[PDB]
Every structure is written in C-alpha cells, then in structure tokens.
C-alpha cells in the first residue's frame, strides 16, 4: 500500500502527497517543534511491500542520525521511501547511500547557519 | 528510443519483467550474467536521444566506478539511462547531481587505496 | 586523555598494536569481538578526551549505530579520531565527512553481500 | 610558502580570534590577509601565492560569505596549485577528503540552481 508522511506549511506537503495519489487515511503528519505521533503511527501500520512518499528529505528525521535509523527500520520492514521533491528513493543500496550523503550535507548547512 | 538492460552477479527475470512493464520491447532488452556480452550488443544499437532503462542503480556496473564509466560513455553519445526503482534519469538535474556525487565517492575510494 | 577502541582475533591484534603505535597506552585500549569493551570505554571517558579508532569500519556494526555512537560521545564532549581515514569528529564538517564515508563503506558491504547471497 | 586568511561580516572579535589562531598555527604576521565584509585582503593574497603554497583558514565558514562562494574560491586557488587548510576541521583541499567534499558540495549547489531555473522557466 501507498503511504504519505509530512512534517512541519503542512498543507503544501499534504496536498502534494494527495496529488501524488496517496489516500487521506494513509497520510500521517507531525507538527514538529510528542513530535513523533504521526511517524510512530506510520511505523506501526507499515508492512512488507509498502511505499512511503515524503515531500522532502528534511521532513523525515529531525536530524541525520534520526533519519538513518528510520531508513534502517523501514528497510528492515521491507518498506521503500520515495522523496518527491528530492527525486530519489531508498529502494536500492546506492539509493540509500546517496540519501544518507544528502542528509549529512543538509545537516552540515544547518549547523553552519546556526554557528553564523 | 527506449532500450533495457539487466544484469546479475549470479534471478534475472525480476529485472526483465520490470523493464517489460515499463514499456521496453522484448527485442530491446539485453542482459548480462556473472561478462559484457549483452552490454556490447546494446552499445551497437543505441543512438543519440535514446534512453536505456535499468531496474536499480545497483544493477548497472560491477562496481560504482564501472557504473559511472558506463553512464559517462553513453552520455558522450547522447544516450541517457533511467533507473526505474530509484526513479532517477541521468539526464535530469537530480540525475546529474547523483552521478557527480557517485564520481566523487569513486575517486575518493581510488585515492584512498593509493 | 587519549583512548583507543577496536572492534572485529589476529585482526584485533593488528588493530591493538596499531593503536599502541599511534600512542595509546595499553590500559586505555578497549576491544570488542558485542559491546563489553565499549561499555567500559563509556565509563572511563570524560569531557575533552579523544578516542582513536584504526578504521571507520570498526566503530559501529552499521551506519545507524556509528552515527548514534558519535552523537553520544559528542554530547559528552568526547571526540573520535579515525587513523586510516585521516579525519576526526571534532567539527560538524568532520562529522559530515565521517557520515559520508560510512555510507560508502556500508554500500560496498551490501554490494559484497548480494553477490554472495 | 605558508599564508593565512581571515574573514568576517562585521564582528571584529572573531577576526582577532582568527588572526590569533593563524599565528598560533605558524603563519607569519605579514602573511595573514584579512577582510571585513570586502575582498581587499583576498585580492592582495592572490597576488602573493604560487603553485605549491598553502593558505590556512580557521574554519570552512571563514573563507566565503556562503557555501557557493567558498567552493568557487577553493576551485580558483586549486587551479593555481594553491591549497587551503582548514584548521578547526582538520581538512586540506588537496587531500582525497577535501576533493570529495568540494565535489559533493558543488554538485548539491549546482542542483539547487537548476531547481531555481526550472521554477523560473515554467
């Protein structure tokens, strides 16, 4: 089954997931600052063969460590994640490597700006 | 204009079925097991503007360097590659970013050894 | 203070000699064959300390575990230096570089595993 | 030859921390070039460097105003055969790691520009 995840501007993500063909009862959301309600519900409901659509790489984990763990868990469950805006999926080991690289790069930029 | 390539280390029907399901004609699908024979046949048939479909990034080369080399030589003759499961085309700005990230990785691995 | 950590017997003995030759005192070297040595390291280590590791591949069991270990030690004010890779977790760029190289090592491992499995 | 470069937006305090760190890493006082953002010290530096030279910089973030600027400056010096050593990060631009970081960051920056162009074009 096809799922969607969105996190905070949420309507920009939610409408985008719906227009990607995710049904409403399969869209889970978190208002980030229990920042994990929706994601925990998604982690529970997902099963082997399922697909999760995420608008952006940044909307998954709250940092690179968190995102790498989530990808590990979903992959272990036999669930692939596709990032709509980034145009990449976790559906191959090269794919996962690139996603991890991009998260790491995006994390570094946040930290540079935070020090600045 | 639409071609297909499948490769295994050792089955092979999973990739071919995916290529067929993406609209590649059976006579445009070339395969390899374990040595360049099917990839060679594909080289002689493809033309500027054509697109070669592949199931995953994982399936193209023997390793990352080899895959990058293949991408770049098909790119030299105006031929792009679409990786189905990854949802990535080498001729898009994302595909180009990915190939450059992979080239960086492969060069670093090479320099590391030295 | 300078500590050493090695995960894997001969390849563990190569790593230990390498850490000693890198300047780590024998009694500050901790090893694992799952995490008995790491649990001991966690207890001795204090703010401003540095852990030496021969290769990136020898800290965690996978990328998720390694980044988590780094996050944890960083939170204690303990940095990690990888001898072979020539990089430390001191700055956010070092951490970024270490994440990248782990992702690369992991991909290679998965590439090896599939051509075997 | 060994040079140093320090750059700030406005804060004098961090410029002094940078210059001090540069001296402490062994750059001669007459070999430190500075800017208060601009490019005055950088333009002077460019006249003085030659193939083989090394420029110390405190942190990656003290070279350019942003990532895209930093990458362009690294590539400019690199084409001259001049490398940059970032002290706090422990990375040289001419190592396999510095080369990898520069290439990966320029790939990402290039994708973001392509992204803007597509939104502009459509």
Curated annotation (Swiss-Prot), chain D:
Extract the GO molecular function terms from the UniProt entry: DNA binding; DNA strand exchange activity
- Is DNA-binding among the key words of this record? yes
Q: Which GO terms describe its biological process?
A: DNA integration
Show the disulfide pairing: none
Q: Does the keyword DNA-binding apply?
A: yes
| Keywords on record | DNA integration, DNA recombination, DNA-binding, Plasmid, Transposable element
Residue ranges of domain Resolvase/invertase-type recombinase catalytic in the record: 1-122
Superkingdom of origin organism: Bacteria
Active site residues per record: 9
Q: What does this protein do?
A: This protein catalyzes the site-specific recombination of the transposon and also regulates its frequency of transposition.
The similarity annotation says: Belongs to the site-specific recombinase resolvase family.
- What protein is this chain from? Transposon gamma-delta resolvase
Q: Which organism is it from?
A: Escherichia coli (strain K12)
């Amino acid at each position: 089954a096809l799922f969607g995840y969105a996190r905070v501007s949420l309507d920009i993500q939610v409408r985008a997931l719906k227009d990607a063909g995710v049904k409403a009862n399969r869209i889970f959301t978190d208002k980030a600052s229990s920042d994990r309600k929706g994601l925990d519900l998604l982690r529970m409901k997902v099963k082997e063969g399922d697909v999760i659509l995420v608008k952006k790489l940044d909307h998954l984990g709250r940092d690179t460590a968190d995102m790498i763990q989530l990808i590990k868990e979903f992959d272990a469950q036999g669930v692939s994640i596709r990032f709509i805006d980034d145009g990449i999926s976790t559906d191959s080991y090269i794919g996962k490597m690139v996603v991890t690289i991009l998260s790491a790069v995006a994390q570094a930029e946040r930290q540079r700006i935070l020090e600045r």
